[PDB]
Design a protein around this nucleic acid. Structure first.
Lengths: 117, 154
RNA sequence: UUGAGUGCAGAAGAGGAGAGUGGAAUUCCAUGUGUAGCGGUGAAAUGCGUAGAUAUAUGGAGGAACACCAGUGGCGAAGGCGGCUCUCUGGUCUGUAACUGACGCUGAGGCUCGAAAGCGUGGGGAGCAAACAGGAUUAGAUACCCUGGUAGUCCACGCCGUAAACGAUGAGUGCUAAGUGUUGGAGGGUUUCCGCCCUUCAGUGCUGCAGCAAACGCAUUAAGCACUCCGCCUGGGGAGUACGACCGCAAGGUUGAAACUCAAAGGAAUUGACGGGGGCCCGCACAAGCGGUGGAGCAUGUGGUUUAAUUCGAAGCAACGC
């Protein structure tokens, strides 16, 4: 519990799912939330409709342990991070640092084949 | 339709109240062109208005308009093959038409034996936050803003 | 001495080989935090996860490739060459002229270099991925789709010597209107020139006279006017096959016909038609409403079964109260 009350949330998104986890300043974990974990199936996990309620189910368990301020970290650029932040503001947080760090190479390894569709 | 906007057909006022709104109220009751029966049962509804808690025969209709009339509605404005419906402000005439629809076209369901107790007392109920058409607007606003974040940017 | 070469003075440059080094990113391992999913598709499934996954912070291991700079920019005879530091070393341009004095060009045979894939011997595997396994799609799918996965891709030393190795344009030199960018110089006017303006050398694009071309097009980087030298062609198949010869461990490479068939095969352009190519318009075509059909009962019209006969036509819109 311990009422750490100042942490960083992490928004990780694909083209078919997203995951939000609110962590500490380490960031040691408090609570995660996943679009498949909230009952969705199939392709619907791409839309930001799951992002709002995933952010809500994260922040409830988060500020049961005491939470005031939060920072934003964005990975995997798609549709999820557009509405995850403004839904994350809605249940009472203090968003004050927004960054989009993407794991970007400098041409290290090879990407796979194209899709002949 | 395709080319440009169409005309909108302003109407004639009443033979008694000199109202276009009550005229339009009659015309969204009328079935098969029987206008006189619907008009006379609406004057009977005003007579039921005037007796039981007679306050004003028209302010009760305006408060029935108060507790029903929307301000928000979602509209499926996708762009590139999506499903991002946007809660959009409604046109004011369509707003009043949805109000008349939610008053009269829901009043089929009271099911009481006297044939205009589903009309007169029904619009009496809508004046003071009763009648299920108010909660229709409530759940309409609650299913609105379900995509408040990822649709209001368009 | 005008062509052709060494002077001395400079200049640019992913030219080559050898030796070291830098960070990011992926994968693996360790540690902490943290629970029910992660991953994938048009849709699903195979798959991994309570033997604690995914995710998030800390380190540790190893391989491969060099984010912005980057530009119709540069270098080289071509194939090709982009992180950084150093040793050896090739080539091009500009000035100038004391010095050699026609020493040149092309070049059958011969030699050298020569993308990927492939072969032998010895190392290493981070990704990626022929062959292969499984799931899915389909009438069927020994494919496209998803999950895995070896040889290979890397280095050293040898071999083969092919490509749509292309500007599909052999090499050397001379001559023939302009305009416009840009890489590297030299000179002059002017000048805190670092800008700017004029003159001139080597590349390098773009547009356009004459001229050429069947057309498309080309056009001082000619496919124009010419000379010198080399290579190749003579209807389409048969076929770069057969024999002979040479090279190679092997796949194969180089040189290279006839018997017999056909009356065509081929280039460029014009008009239609079509596309599962594109841009614009218009209609109760969508969207907004109102009333319906498909549910029930009956009338009526077709298909099917029938009898001896159920007489004929009409079959998507555009047949079925015809």
């Amino acid at each position: 519990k311990k009422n750490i009350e100042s942490g960083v949330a992490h928004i990780h998104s694909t083209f078919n799912n997203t995951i939000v986890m609110i962590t500490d300043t380490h960031g040691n974990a408090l609570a995660w939330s996943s679009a498949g974990s909230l009952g969705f199936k199939g392709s619907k996990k791409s839309t930001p409709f799951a992002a709002q309620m995933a952010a809500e189910a994260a922040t409830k368990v988060a500020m049961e342990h005491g939470l005031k301020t939060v920072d934003v970290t964005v990975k995997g650029p798609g549709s999820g991070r557009e509405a995850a932040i403004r839904s994350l503001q809605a249940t009472g947080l203090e968003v004050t640092a927004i960054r989009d760090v993407t794991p970007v190479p400098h041409n290290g390894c090879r990407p796979p084949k194209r899709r002949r569709v | 339709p395709r080319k440009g906007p169409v005309a909108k057909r302003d109407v004639l006022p009443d033979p008694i109240y000199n109202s276009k709104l009550v005229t339009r109220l009659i015309n969204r009751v009328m079935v098969d062109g029987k206008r006189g029966i619907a008009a006379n049962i609406i004057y009977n509804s005003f007579d039921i208005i005037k007796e039981s808690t007679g306050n004003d025969p028209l302010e009760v209709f305006e408060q029935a308009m108060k507790n029903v009339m929307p301000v928000l509605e979602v509209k499926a404005r996708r762009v590139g093959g999506s499903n991002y419906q946007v809660p959009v402000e409604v046109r004011p005439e369509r707003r009043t038409t949805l109000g008349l629809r939610w008053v009269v076209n829901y009043a089929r369901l009271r099911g009481e034996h006297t044939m205009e107790e589903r009309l007169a007392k029904e619009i009496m109920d809508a004046a003071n936050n009763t009648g299920a058409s108010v909660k229709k607007r409530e759940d309409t606003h609650k299913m609105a803003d379900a995509n408040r974040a990822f649709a209001h940017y368009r």
